[model samples]
Target chain A: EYDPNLKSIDTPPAVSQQMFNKVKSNGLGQYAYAKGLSSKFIESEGVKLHYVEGGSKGTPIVFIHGFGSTWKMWEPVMLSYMKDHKVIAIDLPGLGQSGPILNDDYSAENTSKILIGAIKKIAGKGPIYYVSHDLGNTASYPLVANNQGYIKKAVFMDSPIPDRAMFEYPGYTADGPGLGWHFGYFSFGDIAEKQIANDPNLFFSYFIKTYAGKKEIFTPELLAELIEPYSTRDKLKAAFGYYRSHADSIRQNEALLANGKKLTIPSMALTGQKGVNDVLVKEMRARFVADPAQYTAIILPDTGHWMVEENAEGVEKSLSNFLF
Target chain B: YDPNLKSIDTPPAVSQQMFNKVKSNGLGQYAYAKGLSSKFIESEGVKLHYVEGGSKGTPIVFIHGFGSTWKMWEPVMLSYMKDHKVIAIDLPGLGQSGPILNDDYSAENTSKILIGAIKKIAGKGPIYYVSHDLGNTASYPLVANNQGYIKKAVFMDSPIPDRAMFEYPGYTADGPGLGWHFGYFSFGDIAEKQIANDPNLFFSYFIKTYAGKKEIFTPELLAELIEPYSTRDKLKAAFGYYRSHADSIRQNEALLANGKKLTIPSMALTGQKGVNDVLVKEMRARFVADPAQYTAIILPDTGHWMVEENAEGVEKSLSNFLF
Candidate 1:
């Protein structure tokens, strides 16, 4: 954790309380209330997870978000799904507002167990569905793969890219540059913190917009939500822990697959036009699903890894058709 | 106005279209959301290009800064144009407007010319004035003279060189912002070389020096900045804002000492992260006033480009004060 005194950031004077007050009544803030959601946090298994809860009730759809992101990453999704379905979007533990976890407790299996437990407690039932994205599939896939019956109709937006080969990073191999240094960049102990310490805008905005298909979709307000988690040193480290624990999650997924395990739940794997790795596509269809007929793989047009925000209109329509 | 115009784009005339192009697709980060059209008027022997559109009500005149044409005024002007008869003008030596005839590009002369333009176009309506950088030179007088056409004057980070005569250092020729502007801007020979080869290198760096948030200035916006001064001759013309440095301040000092000072109701908008932040603070006590006095509003997380970097805050002050 870097101290504020040592590193000076080129941050602007903050305007949330004021910016929100100004825009809230118009298009953003008031619009959020129309959905049955508001910001709240719930503690599960000794970890505090920030969330947006209470949408239209009909078998809760819990949303899991992406790197350096809170549940707020799925705001566009929440705004849409909340119209008819009950929803809860949670910030995964060890990142976002879930704060830092000590040692290696942020392992893949542990995170899955904690997530399943938290969803059931909020949902008050088994067979809770998931609308997960990016690294979220690390926990979502492991939960259904190991525990079964947790995520009912999972819409894995961008993670666990079951299409990519397991236990292999594309960059470290023959694939030059390895889909960018993002995994290593996030997993670092202090390098990530130090580089972004003075200018989080520089660090996050660089990576945030770089990966999106429609980069400009990240208006300043939306960008602020993504950066808030890493604003503090403790929070920053907690987020990096997710990346630090990346290998373990991959190993667990590999082990689950090698054991001839198959996911019995109904699932849909979504890929951007940029495409996920080939192995992920094979694993999801040929092996992961118990009944191959229940698995649906859709390639969304005009999108990248961060396709949810980059192409929300497509995600919303794709999600409704698959899950609803 | 062109009959083809329907939305914010679709300008009335071809020349006006070029002006909008610089703001919408060029230096302004393509952020304009209002329809615009330009008209030419000869004010004080200098032909001036000014935009005349937006919903008509109480008049609001936009004044551009050094190294800038009227299009840079989009961020603030668009916000108020819905309720006010918004207008933006190219300084005589910048944008589509050509060079002035006299060696006098003095603030006093520009002020007289601006008053003439306002009286002709705005039709004697009291102006809700918002001025940025060097544009404040032409604008400071309406408030100072208690002109009937001006109800309020908003000075945005435009440091009057007179401030350097007293407490402000580095303001003469080598400082950032307009502080060092006079040094390079005067003397046609030096001004020509420094900005001769590349317009983007000079304009982008100039905007960068005053920005509170760096991202607001983009490659697209940098392209916009370069278009106005595409040639060394054009660059030299804009530098006219800098020449005869010591002469204008003398006229300003004579006014300050000549008994009745400017009592114009005025507001000085300064960015906390902007180059003019500290200087504006010093100017609060320095500006000699008679009719109305100077009020301070500091923008946070903002630099020199107060118009685009903090449009909401800038518009809030102008709309609230003038309305």
Candidate 2:
């Protein structure tokens, strides 16, 4: 069953409408609709995983969006690959149009199972490529580590896998913006959700402005699309679910390493130059992969954490090169 | 007219007295009846609001920390004002005080205004400096820069912003460190937006976290505490202290590098459940010239809001130290 906290209301129609408006203005909707790409949902672990389905050729690439984002975040980048490959961009469980995972256990270990089940049902067997960003990498790590044969290549875009060293860093570093502050706040029990509940607009704007390297990228329409998904109380709390799982994610990662289950799949660290450049790549190399030769790094200039939105061309181009 | 002090042409709409009236029907008005009044002085081009009372005995200046106003010291001040010359000030950008003209919340800039205000009010007399939290930022430089002016110093539940504070455990296996706010508030604009939406909820939430006796933050008490910071501007001003961490640390580092230590008698008091003796050790090691002269006391079963959470203990410790 879906998280009991979730109301059994008709949630998808409104979300689908909003997603349509975002992509329609941008032309992705017209293209997808014309090409027979459909917006649909699949049930995995009693949670409805909303995804966009299109393209029946070549290796299937599953697109997963980052924190505080929906499947629409990938719409811009997904459009480029739709003609050449089978593309399925899914809303991570408990976010966007997806139903909250059963029992609200948002730990990477649990959510990765939901992701695996949904991906299996939606895209089916081996040779599935993955393009994931931010907290999307949280589930992707376990997903890859556990299913080495099924998932071929993965592009981890601009986010560090949560590890113990995250806590060991100095509390106040004047190096960059307050990127580290929210990690703890978001992970703190109901603190971030409660504070965000007060004013969702201000918090979202603040968040967007903080990490955005290219200000021009966030047009009014695009900005509205990002904000609309997690603007309400239940929606916002569901978004924070990923952050709350960080502690468990850390423990789970430790257990993975303890069991000697290193990622053998070819991985690409696609970093945003102004965002988490070397920070994420270093963590990827240091902990996740067994062989340094298995991983490659690419930096997209003039991009922040919102790499897909900020530099859709760069993301699509990188995915094309890496996937091919 | 005192040459150093300039009065505001038109005062703020909510006087410190009026703010308290709404909190508990003229709770702070009693200070005015007892000869204490809310007054403002132009120092460093900022209007500094303070409540001044007590005509006799040694001058005791009370400076409060973040999320708190001069009114936080009301219960403790009323008890001592009868025997001590009490002056509790609203740090610039907090309470009814105006923002720093250039918006520089650095202790170097902030301490300059505090010095000007103290000089105008105390009038060349040696005064006792009792400060808590961010109040310690300005108070440290106040006493350190003007050594002979401050007769005694009592820093509560604070260690000066130093490299050591950054190295303090942020996230341990057990839990988060006490310095979580240090990272969050230092975020400036991003941090401001977080608190700006609802200052009341955030302020109350923040204060309750550090409370040893959480029950002490009753609705009436919370209303009184958040009264000055209800407005967005006031909230921005309060956060300026945290945002100015770089400059504050720079100032203190410069002072320490030059071996400019507090030569006077000093005392450090912290709640057992709060910072404990961490602040005491810091005062002795970093600031006080003679370690032996720095007295340390950990109040019983208390947290960060020592003055309110355990007023009697604070009063007892302060009286013993001052006497």
Candidate 3:
């Protein structure tokens, strides 16, 4: 008794067509589309998840977007290298076209299980390149640390890691005002969810405005396109849930670390120089991995939290040079 | 009866406004505006003329622009260092400016004349400078090879020796559509008239199209603003009349052979990275002369021309660093 009406109008055929056209017609659009990528919605474990896939074979690159964003963030990036590489952009549960998860599978671990299922279904049998930003980066930690065989390489852009020095160190808090805010909000899930739902536009506007520095860069066209996915109450609630679930995951990860285990994947951390906790990127990279050869850290200059949109060219250059 | 009615406008009020603005408000408009410690416009035997700024400051710096006179820099100079000291000279027979008849006024000879004038004006002071277009790097022979008076320098969108390689694609016949015409122009006679007919407007167009990369940042107003300081006839005469003698080439070659490099604190900003990469390397190798402290930034995604319109942001960065 499945029906198309169950899907949100925000992710309708018209919306997808518009997004596809915008990506295709943009000057840098060729970078994503030339890779022969296509998008589809699939139901897994009673959840409808939208994902984009490209490339023929080999290890897959799974791209996860940050808070208040969708899989489309990776299009400008994936287009350039997708011809020869397997790439997938996934909509984390409850965001974009992805439907809300069942209550039992809403936690970070459960979300990772569903994400892993989607990857297995698409990739068949292979290790994958795990690329994530913001919340997705945090969620993927348990998977990478516990299930190392699944991830061949991990690239994280401007995301938090569960390090004592990051949250506890005195010097880290002084580096950015936003770091203090994250700590304040991530502590209380109910308060954060209520605050976000009260005014989703105002909440997301702060993210874009603070990160971009200049308001003119956020043209009307860009705003409509970026905000299209999270226009409804359900979509906004689900998006906030990812952040709320993140708080629980952080606590769980803290417990796991106490039990004598940590992330051991070949990891790379990229931070924007103007973004929060830029100072901690170097320290986190050194402390997290045992072997220095296994970790790489880069700080992108003249950019903020929205590193991909604000400085897409530089981001693409850095990623291509690093991943290749 | 002036007979140049087309050249001179009839609006006395506007001319008065221009003159009065130059007298009152001009001093505050420069990158380092200060009241001049000394002011002079003097002539030697063969109508050679000079201007001086700053008597107490550590150095005497000179600035010249493409087909422009000392007056062209009045806005910058009056605002920059009227108190500490600076100098802007009329290159031989240009503006109300005149040059000495000691030699043919090629870029190299002009460099020597500038050196001679500096020695005459302040006797001995270190030279710190800001220069643009042909004037900045063309004077390299004097500062890099001969006098060595210049301590630190700023080069604003000027070509350096041995920069032909990087400019090859843009200057080549097979390069981008906008730049294809560069290969066809002759430097001296025909180009000078075309440039002279309206030096400010021409330079403005050049700056907008190449420097700013066609970003459309207040071009119409800026073009009209720079018109008074440049005269077509004078600019044409200066470009065509200046003769490059054999000595200038010989001095450049000698400096090249000696493995000389610019040792001064130098900062450069350009519109394109590829074009600048060639020029910056050559200038670093030749112009710095000794210790070689150079900082070069190419504004990503801009063309060759927007240096002035985009000057405020670049100026902020430069002022923050240099001042």
Candidate 4:
């Protein structure tokens, strides 16, 4: 009942039409077929939740993209699982085509409620599964934790659940399979927005290229499409909202841990060998997930953070095996 | 004799504008009139540029930190150049120095290159050293590996690569991204281009943010600092130092794990408003061999730009410790 949905839509945001056309022409059309999928939206908690939906089978599997990512990044993986399982890939609040948090509360508690409202309206009442990458895990962590019955299984990728440990990440690290310094940079709301607005192309391309395992996959059009959502300073500011509220997210997660609220459902950790790797799996087992036996890890070799595009084939295989 | 060495009476042509800017500030004129001369040496296949003055007494080598040239130590160098042989160097990939060979800007490689250059620049003599910011990256390895050659060590307002940095709460709810540029400057091409496009803006932000006495960074002084990083390659070299911290950290950890300790007399100085206590804590607990021999000083009303903000304080500390 918290932050109930005020409105919902079956069509995509106005910007999605151009994005879909761009991706369709950029060699992704083979996997990102528009025939089966339908664009959808739900306005809840004064935030617009935009998602793409398809399939009418089994427990619904939801795909949530990482920071600086769009729901369209999940198109190939969603299409792969569409045959046997229902698929819904959502753009996290303030990212991709989604609107800013009207209340400016980008905490996991608020984001998860917005997502839950969207889910209840879009998928109806049934068991569900959650799959997320990077910042997407911010919402998914709280989603699956409070609603074990509603969310049957959860899969996390690349990033760990938001925690106070984020503060401990070094401001600088050499070339490595680790998080870039952008976490701290993005944490500053006004500073990050100003720096990014100075040159959006440089910021987005740098971010995308740095974490991309296979750099060649990011064609100009794809990079352009990804950077499209964050082109404006206002949009960049909204995007930084996710990072600015990380402290709140960390606090909420800590409160959950203090209350002995551990993750009860089965969860999977899919990571890149050269990416976050065992970092996500180890943290989930050591802190969040209650049962070690219920948690599984699939490490993809020679991959980076962008699992959706960098290793879509591997992501498809992992999702197929775990979800189906 | 290393035939790759060349001497020049003035600063690099590329940095003439900055050089003139500093020279007009009186400190630069004092340094040059005291026989300060620029020289370049090809060490480890990388060209190292340095400025040296004074010929007698113990050689006090100065290594300036990130986003700065040898002129950063000019005001402080004037205090020592009268009696002590004073030398200040631009770290590889920064200031007027050439890019690091193979782009390996790691501390070990940077240190090796500096060792070669220092030997050529200062002759075979026991040397006193002072370092700030990333200057300590090379200086740390220089001291750790070469004990007798380095008579004493001084690190000013430097957060040397260590595990402690990983545990540092870099961001807080109130003062979010306190040291945001450390992260931003760690990246490559993008950082270079971004900064190079607006070097004044970038320099102004850091200068204003990190200095306790911000008035010291005059418009002329700020422009002089930005001159070294005006071009794309210079900016690349400047950011390379920050980009190489992880490698520096790895090398530092390995040194500690191998049971190697710095046996020389070491001093840690910081601005009250800078890293302050953290600088001394790391030096005493991690780097220094004898905690009893270590001296920690906090210059009142100073920040990361310790030399510029409080040159007299730094000069006084170095004289008491080294002399």
Best by TM-score: 2
Model 4 error, position A207 (Å)? 4.0
Q: What TM-score fits each model?
A: 0.45, 0.86, 0.43, 0.81
lDDT of 2 by residue, A79-115 (tens): 6777878888898887877888657678789888899
Q: Top model by DockQ, which number?
A: 2
Docking class of 1: incorrect
Query: Which lDDT tens digits does candidate 2 get at residues B92-139?
Result: 988778898566888888888898998898777788889998888766
TM-score of the first chain of model 3: 0.79
Instruction: Write the residue-wise lDDT of candidate 3 on A1-324 in tens digits.
Output: 111112112233345445545644562321233437787877777788888878776567888886757887888777766767788898888887788975724555667777887778886677877888877765566666666767877787886764433333221111112242333332222333433343334344445555553345665356546665665567766765654454466565666566655556677787787664364366555555656777778877777777778778877787766666
Question: Candidate 1 on A10-126: residue-level lDDT in tens?
Answer: 344244334434444454421343346777667777777667776756767888886756676677777776667778888788676564456656667878877877777777775
TM-score of chain B of 4: 0.88
Q: DockQ for all models, in order?
A: 0.01, 0.21, 0.01, 0.20
Question: Local error of candidate 1 at A26, Å?
Answer: 14
Tens digits of per-residue lDDT for model 3, B9-45:
2233454444345435543122123443333344343
Cα error, candidate 2, residue B112 (Å): 0.2
Best by lDDT: 4
lDDT of each: 0.62, 0.73, 0.53, 0.74
Expressed as tens digits, the lDDT of each residue in A1-324 for candidate 4 is 001111111222244445545654663532243778988778977777778888988789888887777787788877777887788988888777688886678889988988888888777797888889988887766777888878888899988788766665555444421253566666643556765665665666657766666766776567667766676667787777777788889899988977877888888889987666777877787888888888888989878878878888898888777766
Q: Which ten-residue region of model 2 chain B has the weakest summed lDDT?
A: B1-10
Off by over 4 Å in 2: A1-36, A169-172, A175-177, A187-191, A194-198, B1-24, B28-35, B164-197, B275-285
